[PDB]
Each structure stands twice: as C-alpha cells, then as structure tokens.
C-alpha cells in the first residue's frame, strides 16, 4: 500500500509545515508537524490541561471505538527548542493520505509548554526519526513509518517541501515526476537516532567549491539551515549590509539585498538553495531588516539540514534495513 498527503507551511515565513492526519474510528482529522528530528506521536487532547490548550484541534479517545489505553505507559519529551510535554498512551487507527496502521501508539498530552498553547496551528506532532528516540516507557513504542513499512510497497518516504507553498509527503513509493534528474543516495548513520549523514561540502553563490565533511541531520521540524560558524561566516561574508546581531539572534541582512546561492554537497551532486530560500523574511513587519536562513549551529551542538534546505530539494527517507537518504534537484 501506499499513502500521499498534502503539507502547508503554517505561516507567511514558512516556519513549519503541518500536514492532516486521521486518528480514531470514525477519524478525527488532526494538523500535526512530521518531525525526522524526533520519534514521538504526540497530540493535544481531552486529557490536555484545559488552560493549556489555544484554538488546537483535540483528540478524544473516549470518542474513539478502537482506541486502548496503554496501560502504565507514560511519556516525556523536550525538544532543541526548550519546548517539552508529557502524558501518557492508546494505541488506535492512525491514517496519513490513505495509508492505514492500525494499533500505532498515540500519545497523550496532559500537559504542553508554553510555545505549544502560543501555536494555534499545530495539534501535536508526528516524529519519522529512527525508534530509539522515541520517549515512551517502559518500552519504546515504533514510529509510524516503522509500523508502515510491513505493508508499504517500498520501504521509503518522500518529503517535498514546496517553498511558500503546499508540497507532499508519500509513503511507500517515488514519485519520478517530482523531481528532476536522477537521486542520489548518501549513507545514514542511525548510532544518534536521527537521519545523520555527512555532506561533501559547499559553495557561496558562482564561487569554488570546497570539500570539507560536514556531519548534520535531516530534520523537517526545523526552520532554518545549522551550519559550522565558519561556513557560515563565508557565505555571509558576500552579503554586504550583513552582520551578526546578538539582540536579534543571528546573521540580519537588509531585505533589499538580493542574497547568493548556497550550495551543498550530497556525495558527487550539488543541491543549490536559492538565495531567496535564505531571506527569512523580515525581522519585524515593515522593518527594513530581514532574517539569515543560514545561522551558526555552535550552540545547539550539531548542524541541522532544516526546512531551508530540504525545499529546494526532492528528498528520500529510505528506510531499509541499513538506511539511505536520497536528495534530488526539483
């Protein structure tokens, strides 16, 4: 079987992408936040603490004929982010753009923190990492994608972020008219839990290419593009209104400058972000200050292939027994 589901950016600024999911008989169709940076399905509730919950969308388990409690099981998670919840488990009929598993572990929220209640447009979250991350205990529970691939026609996903822009996420096969090209596929390293793979290296708008190994993860629920403090001092080292702002948190540049390309490398193949991918937009309406999408990742402590990067290209989740990752131009 196969499923193929439409995701929107929540906001102007592309800042998250949430994509419905089906829970429950009959379905209760939540917008969760499909996450390669974390192994939790995670929404909010009736059982979510009532001041904690905005204008999200609930899941009732009450409401759900195959909904089960699972029992003694409880969960807790934080995120890169400081965000963090907790609560505790069912298992129930999960469905994503036609494809069904039924007893996947949905987890409960009793609780959320502050930035989940501020955030109207997400109801919870749907994590693609590998296993061991997953939070639940005593005993882990699999992620959607792991219960999925016994019945996938092909053990993959797909992730085709569009920029300002619906894009798709497929499970179980490739779309070739998608992408242009062909794939090419680089090794995973699961010994963190993440989609870990190493970049050959990279090049600021027509200048050279430089080959030095840049270890980072694939995440599609973050933002911005993570890179070493000294790639990222090169690039914006060819934007003449940019500087570092310690009040605003990173590389600010002037929304009027048009920015270079970036370039990074997936073995032998160039992904070429636009450099208008890279104008986050304006750091307050009207200012005539904009945002850098390519910041320092020398305080999170590793570097982030985030949503920056992954739209401007086709990219495959191949989850096979010795996991690959496949990127492709569009």
């Known amino acids: ?14 800042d998250a992408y949430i994509t419905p999911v089906q829970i429950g008989t009959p379905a209760q169709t939540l917008n969760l936040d499909f996450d390669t940076g974390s192994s939790d399905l995670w929404v909010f509730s009736s059982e979510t ?15 759900s004929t195959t909904a089960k409690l699972l ?8 995120y890169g982010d400081g965000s963090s919840s907790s609560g505790d488990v069912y298992t129930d009929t999960v469905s994503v753009g036609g494809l069904t598993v039924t007893g996947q572990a949905v987890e409960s929220a009793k609780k959320v923190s502050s930035s989940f209640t501020e955030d109207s447009t997400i109801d919870g979250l749907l994590g693609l990492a590998f296993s061991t991350l997953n939070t639940v205990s005593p005993t882990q529970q ?18 085709d972020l569009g ?38 290296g990279y ?8 080959s030095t190994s840049i270890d980072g993860i694939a995440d599609t629920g973050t933002t911005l593009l993570y890179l070493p403090a000294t790639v990222v001092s090169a690039y914006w080292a060819q934007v003449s209104g940019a500087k570092s702002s310690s009040s605003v948190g990173g590389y600010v540049f ?31 309406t009207g200012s005539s200050s904009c945002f850098g999408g390519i910041q320092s990742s020398a305080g999170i402590g590793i570097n982030i292939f985030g949503d920056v990067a992954l739209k401007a290209a086709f990219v495959v989740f191949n989850g096979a027994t010795t996991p690959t990752l496949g990127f492709a131009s569009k």
């Not at 798709?168 to 390293?189: K, L, M």
């Open 142 to 159: 699999k992620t959607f994608f792991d219960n999925a691939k016994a019945s996938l026609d092909s053990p993959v996903f797909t992730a």
């Open 1 to 14: 079987s196969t499923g193929s589901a439409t995701t929107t950016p929540i906001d102007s600024l592309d």
């Open 71 to 78: 029992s003694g099981a409880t969960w807790s998670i934080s």
């Open 163 to 200: 920029y300002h822009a619906p894009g798709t996420y497929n499970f179980g096969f490739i779309d070739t008219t998608a992408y242009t090209g062909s794939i090419t596929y680089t090794a995973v390293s699961t010994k963190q839990g993440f989609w870990e793979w190493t970049s050959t």
């Open 203 to 210: 090049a600021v708008g027509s200048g050279t290419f430089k």
């Open 254 to 284: 002037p929304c009027s400058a048009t920015l270079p390309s970036f370039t990074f490398g997936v073995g032998s193949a160039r992904i070429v972000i636009p450099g208008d991918y890279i104008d986050f937009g304006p750091i307050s």
């Open 49 to 63: 603490t009532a001041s904690e919950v905005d204008g999200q969308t609930i899941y009732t388990p009450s409401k």
